[PDB]
Design a protein around this ligand. Sequence first.
Ligand SMILES: Nc1ncnc2c1ncn2[C@@H]1O[C@H](COP(=O)(O)O)[C@@H](O)[C@H]1O
Ligand SMILES: Nc1ncnc2c1ncn2[C@@H]1O[C@H](COP(=O)(O)O)[C@@H](O)[C@H]1O
Ligand SMILES: Nc1ncnc2c1ncn2[C@@H]1O[C@H](COP(=O)(O)O)[C@@H](O)[C@H]1O
Ligand SMILES: [Cl-]
Lengths: 94, 91, 105
Amino acid sequence: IKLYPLKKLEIILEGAHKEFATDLLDRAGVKGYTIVGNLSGKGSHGMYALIMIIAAVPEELVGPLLEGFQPFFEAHSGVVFVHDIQVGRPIKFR
Amino acid sequence: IKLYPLKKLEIILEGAHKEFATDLLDRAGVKGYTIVGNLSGKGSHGMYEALIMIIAAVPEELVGPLLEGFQPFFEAHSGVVFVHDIQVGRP
Amino acid sequence: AIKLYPLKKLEIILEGAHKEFATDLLDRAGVKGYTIVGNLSGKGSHGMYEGHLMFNEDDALIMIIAAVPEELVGPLLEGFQPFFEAHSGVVFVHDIQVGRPIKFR
Ligand SMILES: Nc1ncnc2c1ncn2[C@@H]1O[C@H](COP(=O)(O)O)[C@@H](O)[C@H]1O
Ligand SMILES: Nc1ncnc2c1ncn2[C@@H]1O[C@H](COP(=O)(O)O)[C@@H](O)[C@H]1O
Ligand SMILES: Nc1ncnc2c1ncn2[C@@H]1O[C@H](COP(=O)(O)O)[C@@H](O)[C@H]1O
Ligand SMILES: [Cl-]
């Protein structure tokens, strides 16, 4: 048929660390991302400028990408949600 | 890194009830949530051009108790709940 | 206690000027509701889209979220394909669960 599997990350972190995260995605070969701005939240270290970066990636990049974010996330607020998704043309993503 | 299974709720409802919702999350033991504002949308009850969406990763055991706590509210107020399967990293 | 049923959830990301095109497609197919996240930014094959820089707010990127029965995913993607051959954007299909199928089907 017509659908092909991919992975989708939801990366939630402080707005001030946007450049870090996008440069990390770019580096890794991720071909695109979408940024939801002006979010609020609650977590360990209190409540809430938070943003959410959405990135559709081939499964081959999840491992590498989480390794990249781990060091950041040991010293900073935030989280990464990995989702399974399907797309009609995975071309655009690899 | 090791990947572990979790559930992710997306809870869309009128911002006037944000407090009710976050409180409910807090008392059920939800360790965190993220909120998206200034939303617009279409539902059985017409157009919205406000709305908010609450994102909450939680362990599977919490989903059932959470839906039951929201049931009274959603059987008398606009809004929807979407349950996703997600994975999260743990090193 | 609350039973859960499968659906699909689409995330459709495109420039705000085409919002009516995309929602019309949803209405036509029988989609019963949708939620729109506005004022987004993004990097794409074409370049960068920065919501905050647009003079008309309605022109910025948006993301339409639509929970739909799996039967409507084909008819919808067939409609969005030619649009996305000619215009910026992407569609992500998710599996989700909901407690009230009647609200969506
Ligand atoms: N379980 C969760 N669900 C949704 N968002 C979360 C969750 N945990 C953390 N976040 C987001 O990440 C931010 C920081 O969390 P923390 O790293 O725990 O301080 C929170 O303010 C939320 O916006
Ligand atoms: N199928 C759907 N997909 C995404 N969002 C929805 C859907 N149905 C309802 N919503 C959201 O929930 C709000 C309230 O809808 P309702 O509960 O039908 O009045 C709408 O304005 C939308 O933002
Ligand atoms: N891999 C991806 N993950 C998340 N969002 C994307 C991705 N590729 C493209 N987008 C979004 O789609 C917009 C247009 O993409 P394009 O059609 O390649 O210009 C971008 O500005 C992003 O907001
Ligand atoms: Cl619902």
